[PDB]
């Protein structure tokens, strides 16, 4: 690509956002689509724009061959926005999730030498299972 | 990503695949004194029955969760499972359990546990011979239970994979109940080296697709590495060839 590649998607990305009454009052959403390669997010293009927007929607393609749909990466996925971007019952609702979430995948994956499992381990398994 | 991390990590795997194999040997140098000792103790035990039949002339389901909880080790759970739902009449039986797994698996039935353990307690032989075994001489005195059995959730080569369990009561009676209770562990310690003899056959082939995955990677990003390299010197040299270009342009579209 050539040097000008971030510019060229950055002073574009950048004419959307939430405006005041005296500048016209409006908001304009940008949901932009990138394509990785065999899953490596951190390409050029892929990272560029992971810099340039506030956030990101991963999809997997090993959840959607497993019958997952939509295959949504929730551990892969973040807002920056937050609570700030929801109501406060939605807010409440869902306050700390995400977190359990990426507790649940890491224990998950972690192995350790005794065979029994401490019962806040065990909640965050049982939440985490019924959150997927 | 450069080609010293990619030695590195091909070393490294090289090193676990090597070391699969003294494990391996050191595991079947295992299983051949373990077989040895359960055989010395098979012979000892026969003798010790003979000697005291010489002499002298409801059941209690004891259940132990795996060590590990893997694919194989919840797949023998809910096989024991089945074989608990087949083979246990709550209102007239009593179950102990040692283990997480199969003392949830006794609460989904609402079979009477007798008492809840740590599962590392049955890696001490001797002090797990020298409790359960006065347990279930009290209890047999008291005539709550007169039939003693043992089920492990674990695979044996002998039943064809099935799970091993055996019948232990009814048939110095401490000193064979102990020597039965060492010759069960035996047991299970024989099927679980043999089982780890695949296991690590089966490392040893993860080791080497991964040591193909991790080759086809490097090559796919040096390739283009290389590729971007020559274009951009190629680049700065034929920026500086352009007037001679345009002029020959020129010069054959002038005419003759």
């Given at each position: 690509?050539?040097?000008?590649?971030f510019?060229?998607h950055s002073?574009?990305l950048?004419?959307?956002?939430?405006?005041?009454?005296?500048?016209?009052?409006?908001?304009?959403?940008?949901?932009?689509?990138?394509?990785?390669?065999?899953?490596?997010?951190?390409?050029?293009?892929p990272t560029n724009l992971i810099s340039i927007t506030?956030?990101?929607?991963?999809?997997?393609?090993?959840?959607?061959?497993?019958?997952?749909?939509?295959?949504?990466?929730?551990?892969?996925?973040?807002?920056?926005?937050?609570?700030?971007?929801?109501?406060?019952?939605?807010?409440?609702?869902?306050?700390?999730?995400?977190?359990?979430?990426?507790?649940?995948?890491?224990?998950?994956?972690?192995?350790?030498?005794?065979?029994?499992?401490?019962?806040?381990?065990?909640?965050?398994?049982?939440?985490?299972?019924?959150?997927? | 990503?450069?080609?010293?991390?990619?030695?590195?990590?091909?070393?490294?795997?090289?090193?676990?695949?090597?070391?699969?194999?003294?494990?391996?040997?050191?595991?079947?140098?295992?299983?051949?004194?373990?077989?040895?000792?359960?055989?010395?103790?098979?012979?000892?035990?026969?003798?010790?029955?003979?000697?005291?039949?010489?002499?002298?002339?409801?059941?209690?389901?004891?259940?132990?969760?795996?060590?590990?909880?893997?694919?194989?080790?919840?797949?023998?759970?809910?096989?024991?499972?089945?074989?608990?739902?087949?083979?246990?009449?709550?209102?007239?039986?009593?179950?102990?359990?040692?283990?997480?797994?199969?003392?949830?698996?006794?609460?989904?039935?609402?079979?009477?546990?007798?008492?809840?353990?740590?599962?590392?307690?049955?890696?001490?032989?001797?002090?797990?011979?020298?409790?359960?075994?006065?347990?279930?001489?009290?209890?047999?005195?008291?005539?709550?239970?007169?039939?003693?059995?043992?089920?492990?959730?674990?695979?044996?080569?002998?039943?064809?994979?099935?799970?091993?369990?055996?019948?232990?009561?009814?048939?110095?009676?401490?000193?064979?109940?102990?020597?039965?209770?060492?010759?069960?562990?035996?047991?299970?310690?024989?099927?679980?080296?043999?089982?780890?003899?695949?296991?690590?056959?089966?490392?040893?082939?993860?080791?080497?697709?991964?040591?193909?995955?991790?080759?086809?990677?490097?090559?796919?990003?040096?390739?283009?590495?290389?590729?971007?390299?020559?274009?951009?010197?190629?680049?700065?040299?034929?920026?500086?060839?352009?007037?001679?270009?345009?002029?020959?342009?020129?010069?054959?579209?002038?005419?003759?």
């Amino acid at each position: 690509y050539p040097g000008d590649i971030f510019y060229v998607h950055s002073s574009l990305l950048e004419r959307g956002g939430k405006y005041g009454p005296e500048f016209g009052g409006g908001s304009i959403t940008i949901l932009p689509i990138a394509q990785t390669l065999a899953g490596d997010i951190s390409g050029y293009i892929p990272t560029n724009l992971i810099s340039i927007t506030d956030g990101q929607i991963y999809t997997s393609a090993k959840l959607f061959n497993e019958g997952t749909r939509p295959a949504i990466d929730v551990n892969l996925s973040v807002s920056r926005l937050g609570s700030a971007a929801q109501s406060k019952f939605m807010a409440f609702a869902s306050s700390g999730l995400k977190k359990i979430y990426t507790e649940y995948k890491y224990l998950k994956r972690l192995s350790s030498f005794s065979s029994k499992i401490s019962n806040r381990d065990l909640e965050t398994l049982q939440k985490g299972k019924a959150f997927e | 990503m450069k080609r010293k991390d990619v030695e590195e990590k091909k070393q490294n795997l090289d090193f676990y695949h090597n070391y699969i194999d003294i494990s391996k040997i050191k595991v079947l140098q295992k299983l051949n004194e373990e077989i040895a000792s359960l055989n010395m103790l098979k012979l000892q035990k026969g003798e010790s029955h003979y000697l005291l039949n010489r002499i002298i002339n409801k059941e209690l389901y004891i259940l132990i969760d795996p060590k590990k909880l893997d694919l194989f080790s919840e797949a023998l759970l809910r096989k024991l499972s089945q074989t608990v739902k087949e083979r246990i009449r709550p209102d007239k039986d009593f179950v102990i359990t040692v283990g997480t797994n199969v003392d949830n698996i006794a609460r989904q039935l609402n079979l009477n546990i007798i008492d809840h353990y740590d599962l590392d307690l049955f890696n001490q032989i001797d002090d797990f011979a020298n409790r359960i075994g006065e347990l279930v001489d009290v209890g047999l005195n008291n005539k709550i239970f007169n039939y003693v059995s043992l089920l492990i959730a674990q695979s044996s080569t002998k039943n064809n994979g099935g799970l091993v369990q055996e019948r232990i009561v009814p048939f110095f009676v401490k000193s064979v109940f102990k020597q039965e209770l060492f010759e069960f562990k035996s047991i299970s310690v024989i099927e679980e080296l043999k089982i780890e003899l695949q296991l690590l056959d089966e490392k040893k082939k993860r080791l080497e697709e991964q040591k193909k995955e991790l080759i086809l990677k490097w090559n796919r990003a040096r390739k283009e590495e290389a590729t971007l390299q020559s274009t951009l010197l190629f680049s700065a040299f034929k920026v500086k060839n352009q007037k001679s270009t345009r002029d020959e342009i020129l010069r054959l579209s002038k005419g003759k």
